[PDB]
Design a binder for this molecule. Structure first.
Ligand SMILES: NC(=O)c1ccc[n+]([C@@H]2O[C@H](COP(=O)([O-])OP(=O)(O)OC[C@H]3O[C@@H](n4cnc5c(N)ncnc54)[C@H](O)[C@@H]3O)[C@@H](O)[C@H]2O)c1
Ligand SMILES: NC(=O)c1ccc[n+]([C@@H]2O[C@H](COP(=O)([O-])OP(=O)(O)OC[C@H]3O[C@@H](n4cnc5c(N)ncnc54)[C@H](O)[C@@H]3O)[C@@H](O)[C@H]2O)c1
Ligand SMILES: NC(=O)c1ccc[n+]([C@@H]2O[C@H](COP(=O)([O-])OP(=O)(O)OC[C@H]3O[C@@H](n4cnc5c(N)ncnc54)[C@H](O)[C@@H]3O)[C@@H](O)[C@H]2O)c1
Ligand SMILES: NC(=O)c1ccc[n+]([C@@H]2O[C@H](COP(=O)([O-])OP(=O)(O)OC[C@H]3O[C@@H](n4cnc5c(N)ncnc54)[C@H](O)[C@@H]3O)[C@@H](O)[C@H]2O)c1
Ligand SMILES: NC(=O)c1ccc[n+]([C@@H]2O[C@H](COP(=O)([O-])OP(=O)(O)OC[C@H]3O[C@@H](n4cnc5c(N)ncnc54)[C@H](O)[C@@H]3O)[C@@H](O)[C@H]2O)c1
Ligand SMILES: NC(=O)c1ccc[n+]([C@@H]2O[C@H](COP(=O)([O-])OP(=O)(O)OC[C@H]3O[C@@H](n4cnc5c(N)ncnc54)[C@H](O)[C@@H]3O)[C@@H](O)[C@H]2O)c1
Ligand SMILES: NC(=O)c1ccc[n+]([C@@H]2O[C@H](COP(=O)([O-])OP(=O)(O)OC[C@H]3O[C@@H](n4cnc5c(N)ncnc54)[C@H](O)[C@@H]3O)[C@@H](O)[C@H]2O)c1
Ligand SMILES: NC(=O)c1ccc[n+]([C@@H]2O[C@H](COP(=O)([O-])OP(=O)(O)OC[C@H]3O[C@@H](n4cnc5c(N)ncnc54)[C@H](O)[C@@H]3O)[C@@H](O)[C@H]2O)c1
Lengths: 344, 344, 344, 344
């Protein structure tokens, strides 16, 4: 025999709600085929309509599934269905089931049962696709969540967002400032206090070594690697972030460091800057315990100003203070919003 | 010059409160020495007084620190101080500072400053050890927590327990039952619903292969490895557990499997059984959709009964039901307690 | 359409020769099914006939394949075929192709092409199974190797053995001796000199801490974990061994340590001892630079003697010497053999 | 007391010879300080004098040590000594020992013994630094190797180069060609045959999906990640390369793919191209079993030609052939050299 089932979704994004369902259906079959359906214009409207920074590609999405069901990749399959031109959901099944059928051929599989919620699809599935259907928790008894709720307010529904997607819904807070090191501790204490992650300044060991005598501790061709490692860090922090990820330094800090020590810029750091924007950038100013430091900060603003980097500069007299000021803004990110130079 | 500081603690256990502090002190020094102080009898009373399953050894403790501050192991050091015979805290400093001094010699380091909270120690530190002292968040402004609070009610203070210790405060729930597979899905759905982890049945692929024809899919010398892998799983689940970790099958299930198929027992599975007890063991019985299954369950109870394994057997007519029954008990673990055959 | 191919083998063991082939066939199909065929008695004769320490189970074998082709597990499948009762290779195809057919049904796949070498199978495959066949490097142009060559002399054909199997063909050399620490360095220098791996003594840090004052640095309930970690180490060393893996200490050393400090034994260490034998055990004696050490060595021999642990004791006056003596024996393992108390 | 030793080196590069030594010295001390000494102009001459592609920075070097002795970072330390202006080796000790002394202060450590080979240094060390010295294998009995031998002919001394450095001495061979897929298999078969590694084309799954209908399977903003993953791969391949690492596709192939499908280029791919050159680039042409393929190859040469990418184009009628042609060139890399469009 060999039972075989299908599933359709937009998975924009994928929540523990879908996830659970998919496993459920999977325990009822020997082989399950999971379809990620996209609509260039529809998807596009949902993205812009939301407040998501970057938009998840079809690839980004397929990959989420591809990953979530890796251990079972030998039974659970994942395909992409393109529904462009095909009339809006309520009615188009004739036109839709066409492509579905097409997929089933060029992908060589014939499902005989479909899983879902949205009862309103049973008959139609039965009609145009002619399959046995099976409702599964439509009342949302388990996993009281939706792609729209998460897409609208990520933080209120965080426990429902799989770690594969987190990158499209987490917020990164980068903290620029002088070698004060107060930064790093503050960056760590914050993550601690907010039960979340942080991503150190990659190569901080040499930064401190240079800055000190050693002119060769950090040189022009080092920067690229340094940046790339700082990236490895950030990604772990996001992958595991609770809602926000504190990032010690940012790529601009690295491009700043370079320039100051070589007079040159380095196209690679430039590229990184444009590739990995941050959600919130905070600038720390101090002046109470004289060198070339004031020059770095000068340089940071200049570089920050270019690139059009929205940032909110903090000035403070003592540690404990700075901590509060920052903690304050963050608190507004975890809820409130619209900052830009903050409500001060 | 080269500034150098010390810290004393019992770290029973270690919370994000201590952790934070230690980093703080660390940013004020080039080299920090962290002392884990033990008292055979004192420690012993605290353990038994609590409701912790296993007791953390001196090694277990040193290792927590050893690990938490691994990346900084080149500046932050960790030592063990034995305060047995030395009179109870309030007064004994003369007798205590003796050993401290002894450590500082046989460990070749001379700190010149000490960090802590508990102001009541400044003068004494200044007195008997003669060091500069520095209060740090005594009001517990950040990290409103204590070794006693966590030691008393782990779950209420979970966000304060580092993942290194979790094993001594998390609870494992093992679910025994037939090949029903409903187990596995249920075991996963549970972890999902409770935003926590689960540890699959290692080698489930072959279990299902055997059980089916293939008598060679799982044979006597396989068991040891199988068990050990199931262990790798459990440990990840605990290391990352939210408060509880659902464990598909247990070592007894493996020893049961063996016996049934070889007539023998296997000393190794036996050892594993006695080494890794579980916090809660749940037994699933079914009888509504006839083979040799009833024999396995029979065998499970026999093995469960020996070993003195406290367990609570669940009987149920349909999936959705079983789910509720289980979910019920769990809910009592996350709060209430004392079950043993449950309040039914 | 959807092309689909099969492959048959004993894979006892699996060499880069099979591996290569399988990928080759895989690039010619959309879906490849790889059959591991076993014969209780045949396999059994091949094992005993060889000089392999432990025998690879059907599970051990399926797992090798299961692993080697993990990334492709969604297209390349692996099945077990039982050919017991079925007449010896040359003739039995009628009886053999029966089961093959049976598998193809209860496993729901119908291949239409078979890959192999051994031309002598084309017609028969064409005959009894009726499939298109395709020779692939029968002249062994690439991968001049065989399951028998490796099974006979592993070391001469090491470059052909995948790391998944290495455990069944690598040799472990454990080195027991006093805290001399000369051990560890020697154990490392050896691996270095022989461009191979080594597996440290897990928890050496505390061993040295105990042995010194700290009676609580290593206590009875620590041993189990310590052992298990030492195991994690050994396995990495084997997984990556060049031909041999130097192991600092052995499980008996741990059971010895225990006894000496608790008077008890600990069933768990006992189990480990019986589970993980070593290929060569070397004993280091010294007496030139008085404590309780002579007692440990005494204890090691007593424990070694029981368990029936074949071992070769080395006595030496200075480091450089010991190094040569050891290096000597090893050299005989990489080639010659039969030692037991060595050729001295 | 607390014994403490130093070591000086250029470590250009670091071989298992140095490594071994350093551990040796380490077993004779409680704390060892390892100095990496650089000379802008000297180092620079050694690099150019050799045939190394990229030059190891001071950072690259410190990091090698920093890494090799990570597990022991709490006792073995690593420092950088700048000997610029200080007269050439044979004589300058007065001027050299000055800085050494300076380091010992600003780095707060006072060694009382020095390790090395090169006896000719004992007295001088004794003289200008006044330390107890200790020869260690000067006859190069163990580890018959030198920084110059490796720096001159890496492959002949591969077993002596730690995996941390491999990147500066391994060779990467990238293989460009059409979706033929013959590439990938060939790229893998090569690594197999040469007992070495390979780094697949990251995201090959979608490449093949696009190329086929799916215009959304791989879009403009995907490229950056794709590239970066292909990088993760290459780095593993080098880190573990035997002497050479076969790389499926190269960054130009990715920039080519982009352009062809968006008409644009993407600055990021551009940056990657300039950052990660390859040692040998091979181009595969085919014309025997018509689409838009000929256009890609056209595009590859255009992009290859720009960037000034030295490449050797291979034309061949059948697989087996191509394999030989390639295998041929490689064989010349493992020994001979100077190719550029090859000796054909
Ligand atoms: N044009 C047409 O006529 C036509 C007809 C049928 C389908 N379609 C397309 O097929 C796709 C199907 O999309 P969809 O509605 O399934 O997208 P979706 O991502 O919202 O839902 C995926 C599945 O998850 C289930 N689910 C969601 N949240 C759940 C929760 N909290 N608990 C349990 N289950 C939960 C849903 O019932 C659904 O079957 C769409 O692209 C749609 O436009 C089009
Ligand atoms: N907060 C950070 O940015 C950061 C970066 C590197 C390492 N670490 C910590 O150092 C310890 C081990 O260091 P090591 O000796 O392996 O040095 P390392 O540089 O080799 O560490 C790499 C390890 O750090 C982990 N890691 C990477 N980015 C991380 C992040 N943002 N947050 C937490 N972990 C991250 C990785 O999973 C990996 O196992 C771990 O506790 C690790 O968490 C933290
Ligand atoms: N017998 C004697 O006369 C004598 C005298 C002095 C010390 N001692 C011994 O020294 C050891 C010191 O133990 P301890 O009191 O530090 O143990 P502890 O583990 O409770 O505290 C460790 C440190 O963490 C700080 N801390 C704890 N919770 C915190 C939080 N939430 N936020 C910020 N900081 C926090 C504490 O102030 C303390 O310095 C004990 O073993 C004690 O018996 C004995
Ligand atoms: N829930 C489980 O018990 C369990 C066990 C193994 C793998 N997995 C999952 O399978 C996927 C990868 O499988 P694979 O192809 O590497 O097979 P694998 O058996 O090699 O997986 C080992 C991997 O699983 C992770 N892992 C181990 N125990 C785990 C646990 N209890 N919960 C979650 N992760 C655990 C480990 O960190 C490791 O990376 C991951 O998503 C992993 O989480 C889950
Ligand atoms: N009783 C019967 O009548 C009968 C009939 C047919 C098959 N069988 C069974 O089918 C199984 C087939 O075993 P097998 O002979 O394939 O075992 P095998 O493990 O030696 O070979 C597996 C495959 O690898 C290929 N191969 C091996 N070394 C190679 C190298 N260096 N380079 C390239 N290719 C290489 C072989 O040609 C073969 O197809 C056996 O169990 C056999 O007894 C039985
Ligand atoms: N030779 C050994 O037995 C051994 C054991 C542990 C660590 N190490 C080395 O220490 C360094 C990192 O230490 P850490 O800070 O992560 O401590 P750790 O104890 O956490 O190291 C575990 C790491 O060591 C590796 N490892 C495990 N057994 C190994 C073995 N026999 N040989 C080589 N590597 C092994 C594992 O893959 C893992 O990444 C690495 O260079 C590692 O090779 C060696
Ligand atoms: N200008 C001056 O007067 C003066 C005086 C003394 C030292 N120095 C500087 O100090 C540094 C010392 O450099 P170096 O000569 O040690 O560099 P190196 O990298 O070649 O050697 C490092 C160490 O490894 C040992 N070693 C190398 N290969 C070995 C092998 N195969 N087996 C065993 N041991 C091996 C060497 O004996 C040496 O002590 C240089 O920068 C040198 O110029 C300068
Ligand atoms: N040859 C390759 O380029 C390449 C790339 C990825 C994975 N793989 C193989 O796939 C298997 C596991 O895949 P997965 O399910 O984790 O997918 P994955 O993409 O998550 O695999 C990442 C894993 O592949 C290893 N890896 C990365 N680059 C590698 C390289 N060039 N050569 C060998 N290993 C490399 C990494 O160490 C890591 O454990 C392993 O056998 C791995 O070797 C190979």
């Amino acid at each position: 025999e060999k039972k075989v089932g299908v599933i359709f979704g937009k998975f924009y994004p994928v929540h523990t709600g879908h996830i659970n369902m998919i496993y459920e259906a999977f325990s009822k079959v020997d082989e399950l085929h999971v379809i990620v359906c996209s609509d260039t214009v529809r998807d596009l409207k949902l993205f812009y309509d939301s407040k998501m920074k970057r938009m998840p590609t079809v690839q980004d999405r397929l990959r989420w599934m591809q990953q979530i069901f890796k251990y079972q990749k030998n039974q659970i399959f994942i395909h992409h269905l393109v529904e462009d031109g095909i009339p809006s959901y309520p009615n188009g099944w004739q036109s839709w089931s066409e492509a579905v059928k097409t997929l089933f051929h060029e992908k060589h599989f014939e499902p005989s049962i479909v899983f879902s919620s949205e009862p309103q699809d049973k008959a139609p599935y039965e009609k145009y696709l002619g399959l046995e259907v099976s409702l599964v928790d439509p009342d949302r008894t388990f996993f009281n969540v939706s792609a729209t709720k998460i897409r609208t307010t990520p933080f209120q529904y965080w426990k429902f967002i799989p770690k594969e997607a987190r990158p499209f819904f987490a917020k990164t807070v980068a903290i620029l400032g002088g070698e004060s090191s107060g930064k790093s501790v503050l960056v760590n204490k914050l993550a601690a206090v907010f039960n979340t992650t942080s991503a150190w300044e990659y190569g901080r060991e040499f930064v401190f070594e240079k800055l000190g005598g050693d002119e060769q501790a950090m040189q022009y061709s080092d920067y690229p690697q340094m940046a790339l490692g700082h990236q490895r860090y950030i990604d772990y922090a996001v992958r595991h972030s609770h809602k926000i990820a504190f990032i010690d330094t940012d790529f601009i800090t690295t491009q700043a460091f370079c320039i100051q020590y070589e007079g040159k810029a380095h196209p690679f750091l430039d590229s990184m800057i444009k590739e990995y924007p941050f959600d919130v950038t905070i600038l720390l100013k101090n002046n109470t315990e004289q060198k070339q430091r004031q020059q770095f900060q000068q340089l940071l603003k200049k570089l920050l100003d270019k690139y059009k980097v929205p940032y909110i500069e903090i000035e403070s007299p003592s540690y404990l203070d700075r901590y509060n000021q920052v903690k304050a803004v963050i608190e507004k990110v975890l809820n409130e919003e619209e900052i830009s130079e903050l409500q001060n």
